Amino acid sequence: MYSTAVLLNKISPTRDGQTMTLADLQYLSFSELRKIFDDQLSWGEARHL
Amino acid sequence: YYTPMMCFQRLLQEKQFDEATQWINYVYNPAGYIVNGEIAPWIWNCRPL
Amino acid sequence: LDAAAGQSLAGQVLSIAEGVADLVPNVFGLACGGSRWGAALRASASVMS
Amino acid sequence: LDAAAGQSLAGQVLSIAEGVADLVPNVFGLACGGSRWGAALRASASVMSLSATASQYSADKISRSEAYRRRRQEWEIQRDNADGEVKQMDAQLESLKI
Amino acid sequence: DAFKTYLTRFETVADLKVVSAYHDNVNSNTGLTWFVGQTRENLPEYYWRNVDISRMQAGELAANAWKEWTKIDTAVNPYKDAIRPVIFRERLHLIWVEKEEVAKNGTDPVETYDRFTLKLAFLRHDGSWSAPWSYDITTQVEAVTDKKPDTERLALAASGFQGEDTLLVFVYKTGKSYSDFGGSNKNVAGMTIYGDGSFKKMENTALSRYSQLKNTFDIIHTQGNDLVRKASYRFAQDFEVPASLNMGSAIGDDSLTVMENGNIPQITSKYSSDNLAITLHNAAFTVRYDGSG
Amino acid sequence: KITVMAGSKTHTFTASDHIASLPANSFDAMPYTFKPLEIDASSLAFTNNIAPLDIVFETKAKDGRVLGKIKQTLSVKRVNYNPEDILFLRETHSGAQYMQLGVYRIRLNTLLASQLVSRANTGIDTILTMETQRLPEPPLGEGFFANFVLPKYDPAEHGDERWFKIHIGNVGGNTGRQPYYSGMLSDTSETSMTLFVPYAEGYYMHEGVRLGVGYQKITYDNTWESAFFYFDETKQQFVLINDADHDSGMTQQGIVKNIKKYKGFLNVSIATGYSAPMDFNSASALYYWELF
Amino acid sequence: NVDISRMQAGELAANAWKEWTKIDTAVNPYKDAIRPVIFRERLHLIWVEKEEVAKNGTDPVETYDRFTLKLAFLRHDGSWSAPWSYDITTQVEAVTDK
Amino acid sequence: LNMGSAIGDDSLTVMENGNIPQITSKYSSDNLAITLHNAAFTVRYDGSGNVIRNKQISAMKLTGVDGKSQYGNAFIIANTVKHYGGYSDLGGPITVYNKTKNYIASVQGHLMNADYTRRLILTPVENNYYARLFEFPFSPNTILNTVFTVGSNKTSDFKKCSYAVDGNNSQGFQIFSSYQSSGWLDIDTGINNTDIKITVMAGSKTHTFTASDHIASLPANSFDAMPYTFKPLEIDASSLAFTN
Amino acid sequence: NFVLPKYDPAEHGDERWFKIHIGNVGGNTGRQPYYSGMLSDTSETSMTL
């Protein structure tokens, strides 16, 4: 496989206006990030990120 | 069921603790279990019980 | 010393394979035979010893 | 002990050479064959046995050395106690003089 | 002197020359690559190691990506270099061949043909090796050696077909190229073994089904007597997928219900020219009322 | 419902049309099974021969509440048996084994124990020294060694970034670029390095073999900017092409007239007869770390 | 072995020599065909062996002598690696004039 | 064969990897011929490790307005340089003088004062700010150890003046860091094609091969490490005195 | 899969236990007890045979 930029863009923006970075999302363990972006990517990509 | 507590009991007999707790968590964990990045719905980490 | 005991604990497989593999006749042609009779029993003695 | 364990640690090469040397047929002419079947397996078994032997020797050697080390510590502590008592009763002695 | 003995052991472990490699994957991008090599001395003892090229950064490989050598204690005496590592039941197995000068009974001239013994054995959870299964392949090797094993270099390739948990091993004669399997090509005779010891020679069409694995053969390069060895690969028909999958359970929303036994037990893939078609059989789960406690 | 997404394809099968056996209706454990589902998947992006697909069990009630969303992902692996991309082991006549994967070469074994013997027949001191630590080793097959010196870092020319990717060009069947190396640039001096170009007979296609460099914000991969090389046979040696502007040159396909000096690199040359020093990062690195 | 560099033309001190050392290799050479050599700047020891063999498929079982050239080299511990073996029966037959 | 490396003279340079990897001997009737293939070594401008090295070589390696280079140029350096005074003795500014292109290149390891835009000051008195000779500004507030471009023929004046004053802002003196320089020393990093050479002596034969006639590949001409490789050398040596 | 009703003394009677029997098999057209169970007087009993 996956492109990190493509995935982060797929989740973009960061809800503040700009694209988020990996450092922006430290952020939360796997389950609640799968919840907060449930409709916006798949399980495998979540694992990847 | 038997071998995990075999190892656990021996560890406790040698004043080792943290590895013993890590070991016995294989059979029970009050904090529940983590599988596939998620909290388990079962209660005991051994099916027959 | 545990390593010594364990590597002792793994001679039985090879010794039994030796015993069973010796049964096949080794001479042939116009004078066949020559199988090491009772070899398997000595293999068993070796494994127990 | 060190020499014995080390030299027993060098029988494996010869034994495995024996194993690989026996596979060749020894009889020939009009009755060929006679190779010792499965001998190499017994060679491997023997090298395992002698390896375990040398390891036993090594463990005994080191255990014995550590036994001496402990005995040495014990001598040291009791000698220190002897000296402590010596100077202690020397102080007692100066008290008795005064 | 202790340093000297360690130096001796270091040189006998360091001069190791690798002789076979195998890849537990159907591509060249991920997986674990396994090497077996033989010592410089004239004694038959072998060492194995493996390395992860998933971490390969295209020309750069860190130290930790490797594994140290490891002795194989089995008493194998393989003929020349017909020794090879393979993986099935996702576990390691070693395969090799043995030459023995046997004479057929009831011949006035006692001719001395070469029986070829196919010996397979696997490493267990303590490195202890089970005794090898042995099969007779003298007929097939004679056929592919053209009754002259000695004049021509022999080799075998091992591959694991996990579509049905079988082993595809091919004995053949070295060449600059290789034609399709099955029928007129007499250079390659394969052998399929099931997970128990049942061996089967395959007929022409069954052979041709695996024709595409012909790329991983040990080919004499065009520069004369040059010999380049290729690592074997796990084979899939054209696209590998696990035959079953599952994700167990999950807590339902609002902590009032759960679902469980999410499983897809039968997964089949069929490749028709360009099309890849996935069929899932008896995919099922269950939904039951309970909370979180 | 079950939703399957693969590439641009999204098939939803509900119990309305793919139910195997509809269960009872109560508050009990309701088991749900489906007819064997067929899913067509050919539009997959097989990046590195692996294509990911996802399967979602969606369970919801008529009130609008969702009973739950099961997510699972599968990888589909494309069998790839091209001759060029299967690694194969080669041996030099000097006895240094290595493996080749496409363009890359990795040394596997080592050939140093002989010199350890030579020194250890004298005192131990001789073993554990720089000269033994920098013993030469034979080349990794046929090829050559090229020295590059790269300019001091400049935000104006190089730009945002200080690392750079040196890429290979004309090799095998891949005319396009392939990242061959990465480095970090020095903002206080010019960086010196030596790279081992591999070789095979007829391995290079048209116009020798290229050595290009990418700085971000810029890359000199246009015509006659990357360094160019070829194996000259009349000299039986590897020779560059574009050390300067020239009006005639002997490329792998003969006489060429439009020759310009290589760009980007401060300096490019061939380290003739140069032997790589004793490496501490090979497959056999751990033994060297242990021994030294 | 001995260093004759300190030879003073007929006279040498004892230290120029070195004490004897047993070779533990199980070598049984024919008569006196045994010899030391040095390469890789390390010792190697070479000898030949006589084996009474009969060529297969001969109505008279003649007993020629296969001559086995065995080379083994000393290691840093003094252990002897098992020898490489080569076949030189044809050349020895040619030079011995049968 | 190999000599490894050796320290250059004057504690400013070093010669590395002197090695002769390929020796071939050919015997033609009487003649003995030695051929050395890919004879090579390398040169690296670096000292034994002192103030002289870490300051003056960094002065060499950094450049200025002329555009990189300034290489092969004569410099007026100091023998020994020592703390003289100031607030705190950090790296401190010491300069070197290119005479061919009259450049003041001063280097400082680290700074302490971030308010005063202090001046590169070269004064012959160390005690009179009105007796100042050399004053030079900053483009960046922090110093990047920049060129200062003397301009005129002040080589001897540079030789006479000492006591590089760092602060010397409007307050008059404000000693930041001055360094004693003792005597002065001359260097020239220029080298000629004939300058570098290899000599082989055997018996009555003395063959000198320079880069003028037996050069394989001429390296860069800069302040970096120059690797030197020669053509395969033929050396005839037949009249040797074989003693023993 | 069998799901069996919640126990009722009116329709079941004295006993909450039940015997599942096999019929037409082999040569035994008669009854043959195949399984036994306890019925749940609070919920429905689910089992797979």
The total of other beta-carbon atoms located within 10 Å of residue B2's CB is 5
Q: Does I46 touch chain F (CB under 8 A)?
A: yes
In this structure, are residues E189 and E169 in contact, taking their beta carbons and an 8 Å threshold?
Answer: no
Instruction: Give the method of determination.
Output: cryo-EM
Instruction: Count CA within 13 A, CB hemisphere, residue F234.
Output: 4
Most A CBs within 10 Å, among B33, B35, B36, to test the A interface: B36
Interface of G with F in 39-98 (CB under 8 A): 40-42, 76
> Distance from CA of residue E152 to its chain's centroid?
23
Most D CBs within 10 A among G79, G80, G85, G87, hence the mutation to make, goes to G79
List, in sequence order, every residue forming a beta bridge with F267; answer none if it has no partner: F149
Give the closest of D6, D16, D30 to G61, CB-based. Answer: D30
Using alpha carbons, select from E90, E94, E93 the residue that is nearest to residue E31.
E90
* Axis-axis angle for helices F113-120, E2-14 (nearest 10): 160
Outline where DSSP puts E strands in F171-283: 178-184, 191-198, 209-214, 227-232, 237-240, 249-251, 254-256, 267-270
> Is E239 in contact with F76 (CB distance < 8 Å)?
yes
Provide DSSP, D15-42.
HHHHHHHHTS--B-TTS-B---TTHHHH
Nearest CA to F38 out of A47, E275, D83, H222 is that of E275
Q: What resolution in Å is listed for this PDB structure?
A: 3.9
Cα–Cα dist E37/E16, whole Å: 6
What does each C-alpha distance from H200 to A1, E161, E255 come to in angstroms? 61, 67, 91
Burial class of residue H27 in the structure, from the number of CB atoms within 10 Å of its CB (0-12 exposed, 13-18 middle, 19+ buried): exposed
For an interface test with F, give the residue of G42, G77, G81 to mutate (most F CBs within 10 A): G42
Look-up: residue for tokens 């056929």? E143
Which of H153, H132, H181, H148 is CA-nearest to residue H66?
Answer: H148
Bridge partner residues of G43 (DSSP) = G38
Q: What element of type H or E holds G93?
A: helix G89-96
Residues of A in contact with B38 (CB under 8 A): 30-31
Residue E103 has its nearest CB partner, among C6, C13, C28, at C28
Q: What are phi and psi of E180, to 5 degrees?
A: -65, 155
The amino acid present at E171, given as its one-letter code, is V
Determine the straight-line distance between the first and last CA of chain A, rounded to whole angstroms: 11
Looking up tokens 């504690």 gives H11
**Which residues in chain F are closer than 8 Å to E245, comparing Cβ atoms?**
72, 74
Decide if E153 contacts E145 (C-beta within 8 A).
no
For residue E111, give the nearest of C33, C24, D32 by alpha carbon: D32
Q: Are the CB atoms for E256 and E243 separated by under 8 Å?
A: no
Q: Which helix (H) or strand (E) holds C14?
A: helix C12-22
Q: Are strands E17-23 and E232-233 parallel, antiparallel or unpaired?
A: parallel
Tokens of H8: 């250059």
Instruction: Answer whether E73 touches D (CB < 8 Å).
Output: yes
Strand partners, E230: F88
Chain B residue nearest residue A28, CA to CA: B37
Burial class (CB within 10 angstroms; exposed 0-12, middle 13-18, buried 19+) of E13: middle
Separation in Å, CA of H224 to nearest CA in chain F: 8
Residue type, position F257, single letter: K
Q: Indicate the Cα dihedral angle E260, E266, E267, E271, nearest 10°.
A: -160
- Strand-strand pairing, H14-19 and F19-21: unpaired
Within 8 A by CB and 6+ apart from E107, the residues are none
> Which amino acid would we find at residue D73?
Q
Provide the shortest C-alpha distance from residue F33 to chain I (in Å): 13
* Nearest partner of H80 among H162, H165, H176, H175, judged by Cα: H162
Residue reference for tokens 């095998």: F172
Using an 8 Å CB-CB cutoff, list chain D residues near C28.
32-33
Q: Which of H164, H171, H120 is nearest to H146 (CA)?
A: H120
